[PDB]
């Protein structure tokens, strides 16, 4: 800008030299990209283990009682937003997955219950950093919606977009449920069940 | 635990899909060092180039002068701990560097100047998750230690351990500061400088 034109070759030559780190740093992000992948398919095999283990009936996962419930009740941050009524229908609960959207996509899924229809109950979150939210809308039987009689853990699949702090508030403790069911239950899901951790 | 023999079997089968589970993470930890590593490698070429092209005197960067204080002064986060009594001192930096333990450590070069004598001022943030930080004692001349006479960046070359809420908030803040360095600065200076982030 104002600077000496002897300054000005310098402040290029930088420019040049940042635009090589620029470079370095695609590729750095591209391998890192690479190595997410390959071990999330290499996670697969051993979550669908866990789950033809687990679940083999009217009930989740027949071979191994309220397993995810009581995973889900032994991690602080998701137990904090778990109430005494959804235990009654988490008990139900099948399987827990994390997909890539073909953002991240939490599944659901759920065993033929008194509660709602729905086989599967998905969370998809749209991110560049959160963009936006959608969830399936879940079809309760009559009389069985614990959203009507106050807080509960279903809340957790209401779709969200961007008062304020009202709106921060809420996708803020959204997001980290998330976080911690996709990073941390569904790795370690029996290891939080057994309550060591 | 006191379960059937048939679920004990099944539980037995997940520790053991965990224990596999583990042994891929492990893994992938390694690779993501390796990973982190080379780049680490790859960078340090081209930061020497900008150093190098930037100091080539009793100033700082003389080739392209104040370029530090500017580049610093265009992040907000660290904008906010930089006084106007800080500047005439920040002037004579030449260079900030991070490096790994042979945690992290950063350094701050400085051209002969008639504020402390110390050609380094080093910041060594120690972790497994904040363990603990060492900062050099600066040896300020006579009647040139600014934080005497309140708040300055130099507060940033202080040693902590571990009222609570007090030290909690402190160490939070200098935490977050190296980190905008070491992730932001360093990486990225020039841009700064420009103000084109």
């Known amino acids: 800008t104002d600077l000496t034109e002897e300054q000005k070759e310098t402040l290029k030559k930088l420019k040049l030299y ?4 620029y470079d ?3 590729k750095f992000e591209y391998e890192l990209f690479l190595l997410r992948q390959k071990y999330h398919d290499l996670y697969g095999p051993i979550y669908d283990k866990r789950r033809e283990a687990l679940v083999g009936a009217k009930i989740g996962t027949p071979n191994l009682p309220e397993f995810w419930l009581r995973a889900l009740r032994n991690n602080n941050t998701v137990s904090h937003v778990i109430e005494d009524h959804d235990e009654e229908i988490l008990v139900y609960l099948n399987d827990i997955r994390c997909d890539y959207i073909k953002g991240f996509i939490l599944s659901f899924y759920f065993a033929t219950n008194p509660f709602f229809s729905n086989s599967v109950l998905t969370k998809t979150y749209h991110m560049k950093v959160l963009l936006h939210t959608e969830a399936t809308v879940i079809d309760w ?4 919606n614990i959203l009507k009689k106050r807080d509960s853990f279903f809340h ?4 969200h977009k961007v008062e304020v702090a009202q709106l921060e508030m809420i996708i803020e403790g959204d997001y980290e449920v998330a976080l911690t069911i ?3 239950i569904i790795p370690y899901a029996v290891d939080y069940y057994l ?3």
Chains 1, 2 share one sequence.
């Not at 940042?18 to 780190?21: A, R, V």
């Open 18 to 21: 940042q635009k090589e780190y």
């Open 24 to 26: 370095y740093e695609s």
């Open 141 to 144: 039987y009559d009389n069985k």
């Open 156 to 159: 957790f699949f209401t779709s």
């Open 182 to 184: 996709k990073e941390r």
């Open 195 to 197: 309550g060591i951790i």
